[PDB]
Amino acid sequence: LPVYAPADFIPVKGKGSRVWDQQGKEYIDFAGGIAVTALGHCHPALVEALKSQGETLWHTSNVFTNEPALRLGRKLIDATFAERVLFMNSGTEANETAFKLARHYACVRHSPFKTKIIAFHNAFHGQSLFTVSVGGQPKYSDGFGPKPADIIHVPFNDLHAVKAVMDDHTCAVVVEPIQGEGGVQAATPEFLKGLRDLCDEHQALLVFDEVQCGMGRTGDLFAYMHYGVTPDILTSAKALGGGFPVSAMLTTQEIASAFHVGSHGSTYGGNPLACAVAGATFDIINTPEVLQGIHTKRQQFVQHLQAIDEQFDIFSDIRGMGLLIGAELKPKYKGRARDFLYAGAEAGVMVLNAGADVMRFAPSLVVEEADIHEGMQRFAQAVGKVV
Amino acid sequence: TFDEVILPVYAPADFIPVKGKGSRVWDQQGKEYIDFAGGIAVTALGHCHPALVEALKSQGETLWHTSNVFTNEPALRLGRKLIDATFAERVLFMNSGTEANETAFKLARHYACVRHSPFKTKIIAFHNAFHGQSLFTVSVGGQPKYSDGFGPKPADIIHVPFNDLHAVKAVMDDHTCAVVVEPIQGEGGVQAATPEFLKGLRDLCDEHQALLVFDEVQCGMGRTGDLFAYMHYGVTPDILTSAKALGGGFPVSAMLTTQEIASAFSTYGGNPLACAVAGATFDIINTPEVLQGIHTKRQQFVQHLQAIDEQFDIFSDIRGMGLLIGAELKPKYKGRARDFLYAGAEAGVMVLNAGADVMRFAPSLVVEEADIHEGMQRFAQAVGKVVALE
Fold this sequence. Notes:
CATH superfamily of the largest domain in chain A: Type I PLP-dependent aspartate aminotransferase-like (Major domain)
PDB class: transferase
Pfam families (chain B): Aminotran_3
Subcellular location (chain B): Cytoplasm
Number of strands of chain A: 17
GO molecular function, one term (chain B): N2-acetyl-L-ornithine:2-oxoglutarate 5-aminotransferase activity
CATH topology of the largest domain in chain A: Aspartate Aminotransferase, domain 2
Oligomer: homodimer
Strand order of the largest sheet of chain A: 4-12-11-10-7-5-6
Binding site for pyridoxal 5'-phosphate (chain B): 97-98, 130, 215-218, 267
Number of helices of chain A: 14
């Protein structure tokens, strides 16, 4: 079921896209802690930001703002559709805030009865009771007592099904532009544009969960930029802090104004230390050169995956965007993704799954070409052991 | 700039802290403040404590992040420390108190579901409780103003008055999965559980096969002068949550329970960087000398508050435990806690409220005596300015 490391695989040190365990075994990291360490391990600029802000101020609570948070908010506002930002500590918290905001906006602007949230089968939005109920895997939301109601699930990429369930009582459509956990499935252009049009028609808010696909992962700062479809609310985490727990919810002034003092909050969220680190991360990722490199690097990975398939005949599809890569296993290898993952680890390469039938890769956005080649040769060796 | 950038959910002081050391903080104009607020009971060892900075830098050049597929040495070490020092046999690490409480409440629900019945779902919680602002945690929280207006709430949560054991007895039954309580309600006016109430919750949970869940996010990690408040009371919960002071300012949290309960789902999760910092924090707080000092320091604060009341006739009650201090305003000053908070800031001291009727103090557990005296002189001056007008 779940993927867990045995007692003899405990990471102790990381540098760039290499990780060492307690026994001193070296691994190439194509997993990034599940798409989190977007600039690799102990990146000098992030370490510098951590250490310098760490000497100055870590935390004051939202009885105050702080300079790192202000600077980061400004950067996100200048670079995106956002006019207002809220910082939290995790993707789950950012999504909680987004879903509460869409609900509350509908309640105060339209009607307390405008509560339906449309979400998608196989969606992943976090593991809080509300976010896991918006998530589209019933196995993970069962067994915790009464779920928050008025959430409807339809298939990802099925625009007709969305049209069928939406109405004037709908407050939000929540979608991952690419479903990372859900087999690395990208929205089609017509589907994503269709969501925008339906939200406009029903006065519902379009919420993009970009926790996994945002902050450079796709080769644009946010995936919405690739599609040219602007959401009402967007969430970001993971890559945002490069390994430091931080998240953000982005929206407009008109929507943000539905909140009042006390509508939401967080003790740690908006943290000067977190925001100093996320600022350094942002300054590196949001450059033409790094964003270009993500596309170059994607093709380096894809060519290796194609070569592996040519030799071993294991993949039916290679998909994703930028450095979120999915490789779907052929029917002959249905349900074997975990076995390829563990074989990878034996061979000294860390990879991911995206369901039992899909290999996933989410390396550092600055992973060195030499590391791509070495790690993919290790992965080819692992595939050879499995087949 | 705040109004131009952040969602309007906060009304931040009119100054911006840029630097902190110990219990002193400087704003952009170089104005120096004494910190009796601790970022709401978070910076339990003050700002930029050298041991915490050293842990941050050392782990920061080694390894920051692992996913929950893995453990890591800092998480293992912190888990061991918590297990050795408490009733816990298993520890799950998260980022925030809200997340720890989500985990605790989901675990109590799931344990009931799989060990008893899928119908065993009622959660008993208390008016004025604060457990976080996620949809589930705010619904377990006891302030309807904060849980209204987000659409359908997770159901099967019943609220009764804090400290009302009869009310708990009245609502509990075989369909009850949990009682959730803060041993001291920090946000809710700094109100401590009575001994009979807390022991009674334990007995009722035993009787009904429900789990007793202590939210020690605010009152834990040394705040009361014991490592956890449950230790003062001698009442052992089934599940306990911790955050705030745990990381001394770094975002980290923990859910503590037994092997029997955790099996329904010795450590799980934990950010290596967060856990390194929390390990250094734990090593300092969990010492006889620091814990003793929390009581000495409490009395230093309380004596000042008593002197302020003698001069100005403003407080009807001084309460709390250790370095969680509440001072309730007399009827003449009812609803005016915010006025004293702003006057405090103007006088160069950072304090808190706990509702509109109560002043709250949550300083560093190692706050220097000189800072206690200086900060309380500033607070006396602030009180003086307010009362001179009225």
